[PDB]
Nucleic acid binder design. Structure first.
Ligand SMILES: COc1ccc(C[C@H]2NC[C@H](O)[C@H]2OC(C)=O)cc1
Ligand SMILES: [K+]
Ligand SMILES: [K+]
Ligand SMILES: [K+]
Ligand SMILES: [Mg+2]
Ligand SMILES: [Mg+2]
Ligand SMILES: [Mg+2]
Ligand SMILES: [Mg+2]
Ligand SMILES: [Mg+2]
Ligand SMILES: [Mg+2]
Ligand SMILES: [Mg+2]
Ligand SMILES: [Mg+2]
Ligand SMILES: [Mg+2]
Ligand SMILES: [Mg+2]
Ligand SMILES: [Mg+2]
Ligand SMILES: [Mg+2]
Ligand SMILES: [Mg+2]
Ligand SMILES: [Mg+2]
Ligand SMILES: [Mg+2]
Ligand SMILES: [Mg+2]
Ligand SMILES: [Mg+2]
Ligand SMILES: [Mg+2]
Ligand SMILES: [Mg+2]
Ligand SMILES: [Mg+2]
Ligand SMILES: [Mg+2]
Ligand SMILES: [Mg+2]
Ligand SMILES: [Mg+2]
Ligand SMILES: [Mg+2]
Ligand SMILES: [Mg+2]
Ligand SMILES: [Mg+2]
Ligand SMILES: [Mg+2]
Ligand SMILES: [Mg+2]
Ligand SMILES: [Mg+2]
Ligand SMILES: [Mg+2]
Ligand SMILES: [Mg+2]
Lengths: 136, 352, 201, 109, 190
RNA sequence: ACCAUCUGUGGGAUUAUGACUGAACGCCUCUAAGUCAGAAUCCCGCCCAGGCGGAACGAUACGGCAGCGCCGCGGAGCCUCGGUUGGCCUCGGAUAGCCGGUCCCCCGCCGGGGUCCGGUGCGGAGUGCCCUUCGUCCUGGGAAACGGGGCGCGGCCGGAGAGGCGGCCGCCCCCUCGCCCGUCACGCACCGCACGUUCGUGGGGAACCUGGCGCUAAACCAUUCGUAGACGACCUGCUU
RNA sequence: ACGUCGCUUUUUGAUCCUUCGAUGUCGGCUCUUCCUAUCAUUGUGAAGCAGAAUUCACCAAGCGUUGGAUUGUUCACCCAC
RNA sequence: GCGCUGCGGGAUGAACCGAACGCCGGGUUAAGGCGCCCGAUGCCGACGCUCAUCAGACCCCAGAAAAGGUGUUGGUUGAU
């Protein structure tokens, strides 16, 4: 039933802590609680990091365990995780949250005017589909 | 220290408090469980304690010393004139219990039943149900009543008929009728309403509720005795004759600790007039009331297949402090609670 | 936040939920707890049943009518748990206690309202999967609660009605997704404004 | 027109367990459930708005039933978004659990 | 410690179909269908292979106790595979010193009436678990044949009969009277 | 008056224990997960009482022009209690999994199941969604024209767990304004300042005026009864 | 058995903290409740348990544990059920 | 040290732990705490250990021993 496994090369998204919001690659497993992570292209140096702050992604890199950061960086750039991650809905949901928290007072006014109008265009078309289905 | 010799406690704590009953008419605290397979039937009836006589009968009890031998058994005569159904009440099963859903009354209500609604009938204008009865005639009322019956059909799980006794047929000073709710068991709820609607304003004889050779329960209020001491109320041992300050007492009403008198200690107070529910009172005879046949009066309800004497259940000179029993009666084995003239609730057995 | 906080009791731990509720009613915040029969208690059933039977043994010896009242209904058990967590012998605590309503099952009007959970009291969150737990409904039914079957029958009726309402919502939502695709040209420019500020993905 | 003030609850007075310091009030502000989030509200004017029987003068209006005790948020309290406030008169105990208006001024944002 | 991984795999016969609905195991075979629910055990069940099927039970990070259920589930599944292919046949023998134990089968193997156990005028009415059929052996006397697909139902039905015929207030070392399970086997022989 | 006579009761989870399936520990094992039988115990029923706990139903004050009910969100004013300062109208639930959408089979335009396709750090997202307040004038595009607004009317359907609420249709009147972006200027712009904004035509006690519709009682004492009783209370009767 | 670890406050001691401007002392009688370290009765396990009887142990205090001679007696002892 | 002494904590308490006291505001602590009563963990606290059909839960302090367990978790000495 499981689909995402902790393994050498698995790319994880850091949820909280000093490196919150960054991707890392699992280089080695220390024990049941900690793993040796290394984000060379994401500005996270090699260090121990608990599994409690890691969210597994659907990305696996191919490098042997405890390899030097050079080989982790080569595999990271070879698969080009940075652009692939940005194309995912996971990252898009993240950036949407940043934009929403970044809305100025003027932006909130502009979004509301758009909501007063778009939801209203959708409402009429819903009512039309109500009536069309009723006759049919 | 422990009591030197063991002895059972005097009286039962399961009949507390020993207070005067809040009701004069016996209350059915539990009606028999409903089996929809059984035909639609009433579960209870109201009667009046006329008095007691004794009978003679042959006992068919294999292995007994009275097998095929005649015995004398005391029986109680309960006068049960037919009851009139004047209303239907519906109940809905709620997580807080059973809730009275809707009540529908019949169009015509006798002055016997209407007396139950008034503390001083003599001074009243007897206006009860005068505007309600018009619902059965007005077109708006007829629809409203039909909505009530359909809503009771759709939502209620317990259906009861409201029935009253006919005090005009009894030899009592009281003319105010005792009204009670009688649960209707058997069938589906739809069948219960159909059955109960027909019986509206109709009379129900006792032989349609109970049968011969049936174990039934009798519910009523015992005979009042007034304020009684512990010797009579709880049957505690009388103290020695030399006892100063009186001897019809309980000597020790509790230990030093706990420093309060407990509820389990015998105390003086009200005795009798307590609501009680005695069970397994066998029906020996369902007697017929006085009948007029082709000019003559038929009153030989006390005649058996072996004593063809044309006599009524009434003892020579009439039942003492009750009167003459001219209506239907039920002959119950043994004694039942209440004085003479006490109204008794007859309920079907809850057991198998 | 809401004027009246309606909490589904199902899947929640009795004491944890009581602590959260007790604080809220002390801070104003009228609270309504429903499905108290669905509340769970940590530890195996027999241990918890022993605990409540031991509660039944506590009666004033001289006069049990004045002694502790053992309430059998799951609602009243939870209500008594909350009362233990309040200063109920002061006017402040009593006023706080009046702000709490507890119900077995979901009675009207709360059956047609959105019900909120408390993840700090949820059994799936607070208990390890290998620990035994007890259902307040079964525990109450075995200490003298009479209406386990009636509540279960009425809850099944309510769940039938709520599915018809949900099928209607799924039909309405399928239509609203259809509506957006039909008028996308007329709402394109408004969609970009929402996408620019993260209101849509 | 709109709310223009933040909702707060008069949770209780500054206290240990067996000693109560009524000159200081503890306020809970909705949306503020961490200590680091309280820095916005420090120094903001606070109002306990109630009604009495007699009419009292109203600034910029006619006399009505409304009275106010004016205060100000002084510092954070605990790790959970509570704040301390001092009012020009000690808050009456009947107000515990009631609404305190946390203003948007004195503004620094 | 907590072991990282512990798995046991059970084979599946070509004539048996197993489907998984989460932790619910549905086993279908010539003799019928058996369903079991394993929601009380936190394990991962997977089906492997297409030409020949294979069920694997996975447990990650379990303690000594959680580790023990891995073989328990596998044994239960193998029993279900046995039930739908060959079935279960629990043979009971009636042992009596003086009073023969008279067993009559009613309601097509659903009710077993036991008479004259120890000379008692009490007739024992033992109701078989659903899906379990009891019959009196024809080859050999004093023998009962319990047949069913669920080892647990068939064996519990035998247990109900065995504890029905219990000697009380007597030295049970003597008085070896009752119906006892003598053989555990299968309706079909492989 | 055991000194006569009658009546005394059914379930459930389980204890001890005995077991089933079954690992741990290739065997074994009543136990670890799972399951069964189980008793003067326990809990409930039966039975006694009946909450500063509810329910359903009846009747609701007259020749005085009186008392009352209901409607007309009728007209004001009075005293008195204040809190609050948008709404969310709902699947069931799972958690070693879940959510959504389709092409076929059977339950009868339903619903269920089997595939298949998506989503899953939940975006068909409560970290969410909906609504939105300065008003008006001139004036042009969008959007809409299947449109809005009326305790305006009448009717229908659904809701009983505590329904005390929700929806639909027919007609009449009314406006084509309402919502997005533009043109156009105006409103006390009260000269920096607090209790502003809402629910709200709030709840309660009255005292008037105003129009319509509607109603004409019972309780207690006294008396009586004696199925009752220390006194209260209680069961009763008082022109067919 | 030799040893050895405990529990109880149903005996007696030890102590003298409370009460000497006073807490009525023994025993019985009456009455309620409670404890279990269970005599009986319900369900059971074990035996040097064939049956009957008996003994040991478990769940268990729901229910019961009496009538007398002598004695002020608690306590004893006997008669009888 | 109490008596002669309040005050914070120890629920409660003459002696314990902190600390000794004019009437107040602000700040900070001690001992002790921070699920709710009840101020403070509403930290995405860390690493384990433990399932109790009499669990356990904080000086004084307010209940327990010898002895035993194929419960489980570590560790020691050997052996195949
Ligand atoms: C030898 O037996 C006894 C010795 C003395 C007392 C009386 C005392 N007991 C407690 C009190 O100090 C005093 O009571 C009274 C009222 O004086 C009773 C029995
Ligand atoms: K004594
Ligand atoms: K004012
Ligand atoms: K003395
Ligand atoms: Mg004794
Ligand atoms: Mg009842
Ligand atoms: Mg004398
Ligand atoms: Mg009880
Ligand atoms: Mg009770
Ligand atoms: Mg024997
Ligand atoms: Mg046997
Ligand atoms: Mg007698
Ligand atoms: Mg049973
Ligand atoms: Mg085995
Ligand atoms: Mg067992
Ligand atoms: Mg069982
Ligand atoms: Mg206001
Ligand atoms: Mg010795
Ligand atoms: Mg002394
Ligand atoms: Mg004295
Ligand atoms: Mg004194
Ligand atoms: Mg005294
Ligand atoms: Mg004596
Ligand atoms: Mg014992
Ligand atoms: Mg007892
Ligand atoms: Mg003598
Ligand atoms: Mg001195
Ligand atoms: Mg000194
Ligand atoms: Mg000191
Ligand atoms: Mg202190
Ligand atoms: Mg202490
Ligand atoms: Mg200070
Ligand atoms: Mg410290
Ligand atoms: Mg504390
Ligand atoms: Mg707090």
């Amino acid at each position: 039933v499981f689909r995402r496994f902790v393994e050498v090369g698995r790319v994880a998204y850091v949820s909280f802590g000093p490196h919150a919001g960054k991707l890392v690659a699992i280089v080695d497993v220390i024990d049941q609680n900690r793993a040796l992570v290394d984000g060379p292209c994401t500005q996270v140096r090699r260090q121990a990091m608990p599994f409690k702050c890691m969210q597994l992604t659907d990305f696996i890199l191919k490098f042997p365990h405890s390899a030097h950061q050079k080989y982790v960086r080569q595999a990271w750039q070879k698969a080009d995780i940075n652009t692939k991650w940005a194309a995912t809905r996971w990252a898009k949901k993240i950036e949407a949250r940043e934009r929403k928290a970044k809305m100025t007072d003027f932006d909130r006014f502009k979004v509301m005017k758009a909501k007063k109008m778009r939801n209203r265009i959708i409402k009429n078309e819903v009512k039309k589909l109500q009536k069309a289905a009723l006759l049919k | 220290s422990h009591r030197k010799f063991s002895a059972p406690r005097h009286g039962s704590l399961g009949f507390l408090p020993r207070k005067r009953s809040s009701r004069h008419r016996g209350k059915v605290k539990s009606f028999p469980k409903d089996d929809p397979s059984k035909p639609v039937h009433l579960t209870a009836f109201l009667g009046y304690k006329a008095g007691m006589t004794h009978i003679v009968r042959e006992v068919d009890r294999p292995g007994s010393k009275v097998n095929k031998k005649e015995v004398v058994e005391a029986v109680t005569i309960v006068e049960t004139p037919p009851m009139v159904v004047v209303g239907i009440v519906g109940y809905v099963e709620t997580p807080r219990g059973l809730r009275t859903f809707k009540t529908v009354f019949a169009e015509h209500i006798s002055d016997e039943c209407k007396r139950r609604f008034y503390k001083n009938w003599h001074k009243s204008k007897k206006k009860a149900f005068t505007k309600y009865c018009k619902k059965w005639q007005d077109e708006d009322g007829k629809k409203q009543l039909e909505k009530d019956f359909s809503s009771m059909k759709k939502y209620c799980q317990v259906i009861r008929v409201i029935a009253h006794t006919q005090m005009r047929l009894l030899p009592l000073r009281q003319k105010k009728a005792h009204l009670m709710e009688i649960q209707v068991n058997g069938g589906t709820v739809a069948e219960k309403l159909d059955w109960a609607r027909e019986r509206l304003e109709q009379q129900v004889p006792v032989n349609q509720v109970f049968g011969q050779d049936e174990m039934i329960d009798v519910i009523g209020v015992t005979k009042g005795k007034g304020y009684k001491g512990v010797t009579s109320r709880w049957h505690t041992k009388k103290l020695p004759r030399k006892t100063h300050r009186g001897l019809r007492k309980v000597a020790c009403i509790g230990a030093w600790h706990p420093a309060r008198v407990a509820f389990s200690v015998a105390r003086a107070g009200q005795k009798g007039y307590h609501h009680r529910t005695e069970i397994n009172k066998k029906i020996y005879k369902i007697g017929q009331g006085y009948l007029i046949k082709d000019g003559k009066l038929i009153k030989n309800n006390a005649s058996t297949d072996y004593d063809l004497s044309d006599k009524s259940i009434n003892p020579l000179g009439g039942f003492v402090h009750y009167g003459e029993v001219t209506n239907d009666f039920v002959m119950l084995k043994g004694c039942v609670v209440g004085t003479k003239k006490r109204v008794l609730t007859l309920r079907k057995s809850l057991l198998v | 936040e809401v004027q009246v906080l309606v909490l589904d009791g199902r899947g929640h731990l009795l004491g944890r939920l009581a602590a959260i509720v007790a604080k809220q009613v002390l801070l104003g915040r009228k609270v309504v707890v429903v499905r108290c029969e669905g509340i769970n208690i940590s530890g195996n059933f027999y241990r918890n049943k022993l605990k409540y039977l031991a509660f039944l043994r506590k009666r004033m010896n001289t006069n049990p009518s004045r002694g502790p009242y053992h309430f059998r209904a799951p609602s009243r058990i939870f209500w008594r748990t909350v009362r233990g967590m309040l200063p109920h012998k002061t006017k402040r605590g009593q006023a706080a206690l009046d702000r709490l309503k507890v119900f077995d099952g979901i009675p009207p009007p709360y059956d047609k309202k959105k019900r909120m959970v408390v993840p700090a009291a949820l059994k799936v969150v607070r208990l390890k999967p290998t620990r035994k737990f007890a259902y307040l409904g079964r525990l109450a039914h075995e200490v003298g609660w009479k209406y386990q079957a009636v509540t279960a029958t009425l809850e099944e009726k309510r769940k039938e009605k709520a599915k018809i309402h949900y099928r209607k919502k799924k039909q309405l939502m399928r239509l609203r997704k259809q509506a957006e695709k039909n008028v996308e040209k007329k709402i394109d420019k408004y969609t970009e404004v929402l996408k620019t500020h993260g209101l849509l993905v | 027109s709109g709310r223009l003030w933040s909702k707060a609850i008069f949770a209780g007075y500054k206290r240990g367990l067996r000693n109560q310091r009524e000159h200081t009030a503890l306020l809970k502000i909705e949306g503020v459930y961490a200590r680091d989030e309280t820095e916005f509200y420090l120094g903001k004017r606070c109002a306990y708005v109630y009604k009495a029987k007699n009419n009292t003068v109203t600034p910029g209006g006619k006399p009505n039933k409304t009275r106010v005790i004016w205060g100000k948020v002084t510092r954070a309290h605990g790790n959970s978004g509570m704040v301390r406030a001092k009012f020009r008169s000690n808050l009456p105990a009947k107000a515990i659990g009631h609404r305190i208006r946390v203003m948007l001024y004195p503004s620094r944002i | 410690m907590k072991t990282i991984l512990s798995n046991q795999t059970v084979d599946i016969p070509e004539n048996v179909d197993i489907t998984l609905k989460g932790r619910t195991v549905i086993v279908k075979g010539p003799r019928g269908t058996l369903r079991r629910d394993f929601n009380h055990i936190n394990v991962e069940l997977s089906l492997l292979g297409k030409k020949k099927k294979r069920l694997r039970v996975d447990k990650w990070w379990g303690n000594r106790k959680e580790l023990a259920t891995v073989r328990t589930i596998c044994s239960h599944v193998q029993n279900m595979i046995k039930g739908v292919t060959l079935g279960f046949r629990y043979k009971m023998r009636s042992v009596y010193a003086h009073f023969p134990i008279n067993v009559v089968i009613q309601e097509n193997g659903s009710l077993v009436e036991i008479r004259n156990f120890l000379g008692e005028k009490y007739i024992r009415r033992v109701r078989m678990r659903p899906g379990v059929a009891c019959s009196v052996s024809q080859a050999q006397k004093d023998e009962l044949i319990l047949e069913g697909n669920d080892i647990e139902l068939v064996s519990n039905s035998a247990a109900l009969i065995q504890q029905a015929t219990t000697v009380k207030n007597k030295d049970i070392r003597k008085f070896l009277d009752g119906i006892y399970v003598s053989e555990k086997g299968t309706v079909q022989q492989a």
